[PDB]
Amino acid sequence: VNSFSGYLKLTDNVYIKNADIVEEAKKVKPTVVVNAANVYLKHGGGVAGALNKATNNAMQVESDDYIATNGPLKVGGSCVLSGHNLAKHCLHVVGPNVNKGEDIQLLKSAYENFNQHEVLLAPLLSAGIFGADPIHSLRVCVDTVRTNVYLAVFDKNLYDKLVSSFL
């Protein structure tokens, strides 16, 4: 039993809701919140900008030190950093950004990072300004993630479209 509330069950291990991931994290304080990161951990907009702004820029400060030490992530890769006031940990995961010309095939690799954590509050990878088909991303999520994932989808029309089209 966990404290997530109001989620629609899609499969044994994937759940979904129309909500801001920042608000879900503020309420649940999950062990892991997933950030929709880029390779430079520059948290400029979307989920990343929202998470970072909710940390009063502490996420960005920590991320800049990470990059200075380790260099950029790989597309499809991840790193574990602090969750600051929102969660115990933040798993920064890089889905491909089609508006940058990044390879959409890497979306499965990106979701594989979720399997290293038993429970996660996560966004839909490569959605929004990353430019991928959200129906496909939800499909890849369900067909790749085996651990328990709670997907918070901010955009109401997107949530409704995803539910009505899910197979």
Ligand SMILES: CO[C@@H]1C[C@H](CO)N(c2ncnc3[nH]ccc23)C1
């Ligand atoms: C079209 O919106 C993009 C894609 C995705 C699903 O709507 N996004 C979010 N998902 C969950 N929490 C969020 N907080 C702030 C943004 C956000 C932003």
